[PDB]
Enzyme design. Structure first.
Site: not given
Ligand SMILES: Cc1cc2nc3c(=O)[nH]c(=O)nc-3n(C[C@H](O)[C@H](O)[C@H](O)COP(=O)(O)O)c2cc1C
Ligand SMILES: Nc1ncnc2c1ncn2[C@@H]1O[C@H](COP(=O)(O)OP(=O)(O)O)[C@@H](O)[C@H]1O
Ligand SMILES: Cc1cc2nc3c(=O)[nH]c(=O)nc-3n(C[C@H](O)[C@H](O)[C@H](O)COP(=O)(O)O)c2cc1C
Ligand SMILES: Nc1ncnc2c1ncn2[C@@H]1O[C@H](COP(=O)(O)OP(=O)(O)O)[C@@H](O)[C@H]1O
Ligand code: SF4
Ligand code: SF4
Lengths: 684, 684
Positions: B29, B643, B170-171, B264, B173
């Site tokens: 999906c 963030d 398809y069979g 799955d 899940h």
């Molecule tokens: C976003 C998402 C959508 C999925 N939708 C289906 C689907 O439509 N039908 C189905 O057979 N499997 C679906 N699956 C299951 C996947 O085909 C797969 O079997 C499962 O994610 C495990 O394989 P992976 O370990 O490679 O992710 C979905 C999984 C995810 C990640």
């Molecule tokens: N003034 C600064 N100068 C340099 N690095 C900074 C400063 N302020 C914050 N950081 C760094 O920025 C990073 C932000 O990481 P994170 O919190 O995971 O933000 P995001 O999820 O947006 O990546 C932290 O590793 C922090 O040390």
């Protein structure tokens, strides 16, 4: 128009337009938004020609930063959205009505899961309310606010281009940036847009003025406003009065609404008609402008009241309009006895919360108008000379018989028990469900005006009788029984039940049988209303009651009806133990074994009796008997209907019967084909 | 191709067709079902171009009785769906791959909320599994099974018209009628479709034979089947083995998968790589046909093992292929160090369950290929000779740097701490979260190969530094901190905290600080993973732990990533008390006051310490500073991202970083316009 109801048909000036009457359909969702626009057009057109003077669209996202996916509402981002909007405005006009569009920026309430844009709000806060999405809004600068204003202005322009007569500023239900700027709960700003009434109203003022300047009297400007939020620090009486006093002269119309969608569309189970009154009383006096208000308005004398006593200028409805699109015309015409009164079930909402075209318990044609051509009031003339037997007079039978009646057929309606109504009657006797009776009332009130329908009330029917009576066509509407073996979703197969334990189901309680001892366990594996309702009943009757549910909340599906919180508070207040996250896995002589859904830890629970509310089996003995008789050649057609075909809500039952009625003698495609029309995505 | 991995690049015959290699993208999906056909086309073509030999659509509803709304998958109800299906298959071909289509009828798993048709299943039951919709499935007759067979035949025709190479029965899940017929949990029938295993397998036999006849050497026929359902009377080892003894030689390809989607797609928090081997071992010997399988396969050695040990013929992948469309080519070309490994977050699944185009923590271009032109590997070349400063090496800043780096820009990445990775590093260290480090490893891997990016660790930066060194263009990726005042959703303003109590946020825990006494309360109003993971860390360190949360479940948003049951389970095993449906409304010197969310009842809970997991404020002091300086003409540009801009998941931050980099030096439309391409509904 006359009697006391002429008051309800006076014209009302709204800016440069005049209503034909005082009936106002306020903005309401439909689960057929940017995705089924023809479906919506057809429906809105039907509201207009049913007598609603103004017809509004649901909210309409003005910008991709107002993406509220999965919710499917209307959109006005681009000129790509125009043709869809214009069709709706066109369909309302050609229906005889003024068209309203509710422009909305959901602000801090838009998680933007589809657009991946940053949400914008008054503060740095988790997206809210009514969502727990792992995304935060960013606090708006002046520049962002100016940006918002321009988007709003573009959206208004496009609403004029689409032909709308009324264009909203939306500030209601906690769903609007404007509400978030108003409310002390979301606004803790320290610049000119926060801090005090004049400031918290600033954004509102600005959007109003902008909308006015942009309309230049080619449209009216409505303002839909939160009037009571029902939470600490939220919008109160003091606030709304301050806004009215400063800004009351600004729009063409003031629409009054609750600060919460939970609060706004509360079910009949939890609230009577017109409960919004003491949050709204006193506000009209503050403005030169007309006022709309809501209150699940079904009773025409309640509507008369609201206007004579000076609470409202327009009678607003959302749900009453869904239940009966033709309510204004029936008042007009004196046929008050034929009004299909809203039940306040909420089923309509759950469509929107499940991104489905909204169903109405009362009106099976809701969401069928375009795709199947159904009509809330009319049905094709009968195509044949047929005599039809409908067996069973629950919701499905009643609606089949009503609809076939209306078609002109010679119809005999056979009922086993002393009374008409089936599960509607048994269910409305339950605590808080009195209004549900209305499904049966409307059908009786209309059956009474049909001479071509015979009703026999103490008449069980067997395959024998039907042939002997010579009935050529039958619709089998016999209902369903509630399983007692414990099967529904958690068990697919019978659980073990000792001989010594009394085990009842809802059939027994409907039959007037009540558990023998003091302590009862209700096993609820249905997850909708009934478990909680049955438990209400028992506790009122003096039993000590525990509910056992595999869900994390009792009646968890009611998330979809906004009842879930109210259900739990109501259970906690009646002293009922909520034993959630547990399945009943054994019923022993003196108790039950419950198993925790997460870790499979087992426990004993002592009790004197167990009430099973799990799932149902169809009453299809008659049907299978008649299919046998059809194959042999002794009748020409049988059709199973409602709960006897496949058990579901009352709405589904009603629908099920209308479907049989619309399909009788119709020449149909094979079931290989989609039995309705649909729009599909326009390829780039 | 280098000598260990050359086996993965061998051709495999699949009916009429041959794969370039053994990399097979199984059905999955994407949240762009019938709604956004072009988006999906672009995404599937890229996968084909990435070296995936067979690329498959998600499940395609074959009929309106198989309506799984609100989920938004594809459809093949009739010919209106063909233009859209035809575009998806052409895209894969242009990509150089074979196109699969997962035709599927959901039977009793289809609540039909949009179609309002009667769901169909092996017996009279509520729709199941994983839905609580108030609707039951009708027990099919032989005539309904002939109807179903015919609908499937029609869909196969249309699949061949649309140009698909592989067509599934398809069979799997527990999401199809085939699985419900096959499993003793759902099939309690006594006619020729139940009782013996020969009987329950009969529908499958019948759809297999019909699909093969209809195909007739035009397409290969694949069978995706549940090998283990993981529940009491469900499908097991003896069941699938017998299916294979009798039926193994029918399809062209067997695709082996689990019996529930919770089973799955298991999060890496809960399951190692290759988990599905205990279940598929031994089945390959019972068929001569090729066999595909999944295991969250990211390790190229693990892949060589599957093939070499006779477990699989094809390496199947859903999420690894979403995390890295170009995974096969990387292995072929010998660039194993550039593979972007799935972290097992399931954030993608969260797209399906919220009806939004899926996001990937690792791959921010998933969902953007069509609507914004992004590519998982290619970024368009630099448009100027600019030098860019990126402050913060968290997910956000790392992806911005990596992306700008690949364009050819001169980039300086300054980081305050000894480590790169920011929240990825801090969070990876938490229990069950180690795989999340892969987010950082990937970006480090590519940065190592980019001489035009320079990285300074231990270099905190300020407004003056930046201007002083003469940087013109800054991206501020400074992160956010977790609030200790109690604010998130339940509270929007500070709660009262006594001076005597120790109060920690996640930032303390990351820094090494741990609560002072034995009894700990964790207030969780974040609702996603961190509260529960924090509580697990503490229980593991010997603390006595309570998690208090307004949701009915701990981590309620993990309903969307299929971990919610696993999470509650794991909290119970760790002896963590779950105080759900409660908020903390006061922290006193030796305990907290909690308020029940439904009936407003307050208890005191005594503890030695409180860990607040609620929400975040951006660290935006630096950006505000540079905005000032930008308006003094000192710098040319600044952009806050991740963030520091608006807190979100790790995926949103990565995306945010990539967005800053794709947008750099481009001429942008006003923000009035929609920032992406988009398809709307075709008006009829
Ligand atoms: C976003 C998402 C959508 C999925 N939708 C289906 C689907 O439509 N039908 C189905 O057979 N499997 C679906 N699956 C299951 C996947 O085909 C797969 O079997 C499962 O994610 C495990 O394989 P992976 O370990 O490679 O992710 C979905 C999984 C995810 C990640
Ligand atoms: N003034 C600064 N100068 C340099 N690095 C900074 C400063 N302020 C914050 N950081 C760094 O920025 C990073 C932000 O990481 P994170 O919190 O995971 O933000 P995001 O999820 O947006 O990546 C932290 O590793 C922090 O040390
Ligand atoms: C199905 C449903 C959807 C609605 N959606 C919206 C909406 O999009 N816009 C809005 O402002 N109000 C919406 N509402 C609230 C209504 O406009 C109205 O204020 C409320 O339902 C109470 O009025 P009533 O008693 O007439 O239903 C919705 C309510 C219903 C029943
Ligand atoms: N053999 C029968 N002959 C006549 N009426 C019957 C027979 N069996 C059941 N009924 C009636 O059919 C009705 C079924 O109604 P209900 O349970 O409400 O079904 P639904 O929800 O489909 O309308 C009941 O009122 C019951 O008395
Ligand atoms: S579905 Fe129920 S609450 Fe909604 S309009 Fe109809 S009767 Fe009223
Ligand atoms: S969202 Fe997470 S689990 Fe899914 S494909 Fe991406 S990294 Fe893998």
């Amino acid at each position: 128009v006359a009697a006391p109801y002429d008051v309800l048909f006076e014209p009302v000036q709204i800016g440069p337009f005049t209503t034909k009457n005082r009936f106002y359909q306020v903005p309401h969702c439909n689960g057929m938004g940017y995705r089924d626009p023809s479906a919506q057009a057809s429906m809105r057109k039907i509201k207009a020609e049913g007598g609603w003077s103004a017809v509004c669209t649901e909210q309409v996202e003005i910008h991709a930063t107002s993406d509220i996916a999965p919710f499917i509402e209307l959109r006005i981002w681009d000129d790509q959205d125009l043709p869809a909007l214009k069709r709706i405005a066109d369909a309302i006009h050609e229906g005889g009505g003024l068209a309203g569009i509710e422009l909305a920026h959901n602000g801090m309430n838009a998680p933007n899961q589809l657009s991946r844009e940053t949400p914008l709000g008054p503060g740095h806060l988790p997206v809210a309310p009514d969502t727990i999405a792992p995304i935060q809004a960013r606090a708006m600068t002046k520049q962002d606010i100016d940006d918002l204003r321009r988007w709003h202005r573009n959206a208004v322009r496009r609403s004029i281009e689409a032909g709308y007569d009324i264009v909203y500023v939306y500030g209601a239900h906690g769903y609007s940036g404007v509400h978030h700027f108003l409310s002390k709960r979301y606004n803790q700003r320290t610049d000119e847009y926060g801090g005090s009434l004049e400031n918290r109203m600033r954004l509102l003022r600005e959007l109003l003025e902008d909308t006015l300047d942009e309309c230049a009297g080619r449209a009216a400007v409505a303002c839909r406003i939160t009037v009571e939020e029902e939470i600490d620090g939220g919008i109160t009486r003091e606030d709304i009065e301050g806004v009215l006093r400063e800004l009351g002269e600004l729009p063409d119309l003031w629409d009054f609404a609750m600060g919460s969608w939970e609060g706004d569309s509360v079910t009949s189970r939890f609230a009577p008609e017109g409960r919004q009154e003491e949050f709204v009383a006193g506000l009209k006096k503050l403005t030169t402008k007309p006022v709309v208000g809501v209150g699940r308005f079904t009773s025409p004398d309640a509507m008369v009241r609201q206007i004579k006593a000076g609470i409202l200028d327009l009678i607003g409805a959302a749900r009453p309009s869904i239940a009966d699109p033709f309510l204004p015309n029936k008042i007009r015409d004196g046929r008050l006895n034929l009004i299909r009164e809203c039940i306040g079930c909420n089923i309509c909402v759950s469509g929107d919360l499940t991104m489905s075209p909204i169903r109405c318990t009362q009106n099976p044609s809701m969401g069928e108008e375009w795709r199947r051509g159904w009509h809330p009031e009319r049905i094709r003339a009968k195509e044949s000379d047929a005599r039809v037997l409908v067996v069973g007079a629950g919701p499905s039978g009643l609606e089949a018989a009503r609809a076939l009646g209306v078609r002109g057929y010679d119809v005999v309606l056979a009922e086993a028990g002393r009374d008409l109504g089936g599960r509607v009657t048994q269910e409305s006797a339950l605590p808080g469900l009195s209004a549900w009776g209305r499904v049966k009332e409307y059908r009786e009130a209309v059956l009474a005006e049909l001479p071509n329908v015979e009703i026999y009330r103490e008449s069980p029917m067997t395959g024998d009788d039907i042939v002997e009576f010579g009935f050529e066509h039958v619709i089998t509407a016999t209902g369903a029984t509630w399983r007692t073996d414990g099967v529904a979703r958690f068990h697919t197969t019978a659980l073990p039940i000792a001989e010594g334990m009394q085990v009842l189901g809802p059939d027994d309680l409907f039959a007037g049988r009540l558990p023998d001892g003091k302590k009862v366990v209700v096993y609820d594996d249905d997850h909708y209303y009934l478990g909680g309702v049955v438990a209400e009943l028992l506790a009122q009757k003096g039993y000590e009651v525990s509910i056992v549910t595999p869900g994390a909340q009792v009646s968890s599906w009611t998330n979809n009806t906004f009842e879930v919180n109210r259900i739990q508070r109501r259970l906690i207040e009646n002293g009922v133990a909520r034993v959630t996250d547990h399945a009943v896995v054994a019923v022993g002589a003196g108790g039950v074994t419950v198993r925790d859904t997460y870790a499979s830890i087992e426990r004993e629970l002592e009790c004197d009796a167990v009430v099973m509310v799990t799932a149902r089996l169809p009453r299809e003995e008659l049907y299978l008997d008649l299919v046998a008789r059809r194959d042999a050649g002794e009748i020409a057609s049988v059709r199973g209907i409602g709960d006897a075909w496949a058990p579901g809500t009352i709405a589904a039952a009603v629908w099920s019967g209308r479907r049989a009625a619309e399909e009788f003698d119709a020449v149909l495609p094979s079931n290989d084909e989609v039995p309705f029309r649909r729009e599909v995505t326009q390829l780039a």
